[PDB]
Ligand binder design. Structure first.
Ligand SMILES: Nc1nc2c(ncn2[C@@H]2O[C@H](COP(=O)(O)OP(=O)(O)O)[C@@H](O)[C@H]2O)c(=O)[nH]1
Length: 440
């Protein structure tokens, strides 16, 4: 039932310690995407595993002694910007599900300040004494237990491997995405991953993983919408930022439009070419109305997020200064202008996720997280060139999924390059960044 997201969440968490977990319902349209029964059982079974093998259990103490050389593990290193961390952690989780491993999370500076516990009865956090923690900063493509390094140097009983899956990775790190190397990695009890990518799409190209993924996800472009909603619930101090903003500014409207504005440029602007992009997109797509210089009205709330407030200022000044062609009543709202940090950034992604129709910015993982949690197939503001308003200014995404920006392009069987975006109908080149891949 609705608190549990059609069965995706388990009941029995203590409510006061993570209010947001089951108070989604009061702020959110129910999602039209039903998790499959298979997936539900995958998630209930994972909780069982994570309980038996989790941090602090006897089995975890037993498995830990294998670091000097019936439970296996993958560890995520807190690394990169928040949006990356969300995506990448979700990917690692899917990985864990596909390899019968326990997920442990490096809490970094902030992870448990931002997210509640997602696994009933046992913490997902990596213990603070974990032997290898001090190495995490230093782990890279040239480390001795780097899988890519070992393959390159043709080395090959491993108790642990580092898996370098950062965007800068290479031909050898990429072999992670091949069946045969998966077969070998399969036997290693401790995996340590550093990554900044939503690498989910290339898992669908790995035989055996394909069959399971088809079953878990009959609707293939719901991977981040289900797993993201399962894993990420914001803590009480983040959720207060959401509820307070939503209550004060947002909850009167017949309709909500999200506009997620990321401008990848070392000058904060604001830029007139992007202002014009945003008013062309919202108008040409009938997301917001035109204004004039000469039923009964709906109220639309425009939620703008950006580092700079100039975009929201413009929209605000336009709908203030001029009547709408439609008679519609438009209000424009932006929460911050950042130029608690991480907490505001998360809240804003969750407030985006609450909108009825979302505009995103090309290449931005902030937009990916918001679209995904909300189950929103967005309109993507294309990445400009030469400070000119792209024409067309935006277009509808193929699907609500996040883009894998740095995928491998290798046919593991033939052992030769290949464009892995043109192999199956459900894995395609991204709308924003044509190099990448996403599920459709
Ligand atoms: N609060 C807030 N922070 C933002 C916004 N846009 C960018 N940021 C900050 O800059 C970071 C951008 O990195 P990331 O989250 O990985 O997303 P990306 O760089 O757009 O792909 C965000 O996490 C925020 O800390 C915004 O609209 N609101």
């Amino acid at each position: 039932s609705d608190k549990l997201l059609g069965g995706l969440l388990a009941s029995g968490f203590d409510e006061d310690s993570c209010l947001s977990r089951y108070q989604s319902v009061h702020y959110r349209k129910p999602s039209p995407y039903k998790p499959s029964s298979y997936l539900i059982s995958k998630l209930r079974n994972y909780e069982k595993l994570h309980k038996r093998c989790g941090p602090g259990t006897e089995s975890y103490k037993k498995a830990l002694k294998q670091l000097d050389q019936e439970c296996k593990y993958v560890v995520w290193i807190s690394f990169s910007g928040l949006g990356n961390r969300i995506l990448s952690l979700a990917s690692v989780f899917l990985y864990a599900l596909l390899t019968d491993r326990v997920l442990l999370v490096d809490r970094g500076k902030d992870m448990d300040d931002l997210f509640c516990e997602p696994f009933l009865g046992m913490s997902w956090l990596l213990p603070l004494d974990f032997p290898m923690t001090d190495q995490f900063d230093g782990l890279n493509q040239e480390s001795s237990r780097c899988y890519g390094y070992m393959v390159k140097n043709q080395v090959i009983t491993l108790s642990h491997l580092y898996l370098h899956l950062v965007h800068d990775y290479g031909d050898h790190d990429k072999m992670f995405f091949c069946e045969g190397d998966q077969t070998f990695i399969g036997k290693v009890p401790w995996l340590i991953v550093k990554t900044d990518n939503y690498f989910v799409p290339s898992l669908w190209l790995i035989p055996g993983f394909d069959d399971e993924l088809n079953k878990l996800f009959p609707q293939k472009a719901t991977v981040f919408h289900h797993l993201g909603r399962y894993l990420f619930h914001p803590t009480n101090q983040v959720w207060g930022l959401v509820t307070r903003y939503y209550e004060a500014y947002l909850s009167h409207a017949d309709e909500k439009i999200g506009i997620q504005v990321r401008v990848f440029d070392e000058d904060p602007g604001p830029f007139q070419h992007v202002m014009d992009q945003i008013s062309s997109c919202t108008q040409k797509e009938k997301l917001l109305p035109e204004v004039d210089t000469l039923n009964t009205p709906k109220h639309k709330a425009v939620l703008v997020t950006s580092l700079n407030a100039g975009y929201a200022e413009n929209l605000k000044s336009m709908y203030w200064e001029y009547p709408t062609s439609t008679g519609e009543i438009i209000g424009v709202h932006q929460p911050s202008q950042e130029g608690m940090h991480n907490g505001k950034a998360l809240a804003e992604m969750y407030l985006l996720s609450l909108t009825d129709n979302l505009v995103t910015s090309a290449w931005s993982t902030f937009g990916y997280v918001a679209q995904g949690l909300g189950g929103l197939k967005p309109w993507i503001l294309y990445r400009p060139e030469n400070r000119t308003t792209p024409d067309p200014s935006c277009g509808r995404a193929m699907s609500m999924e996040p883009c894998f920006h740095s995928p491998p392009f290798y046919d593991c069987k033939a052992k030769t390059g290949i464009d892995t975006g043109t192999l199956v109908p459900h894995v395609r080149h991204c709308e924003d960044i044509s190099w990448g891949l996403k599920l459709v």
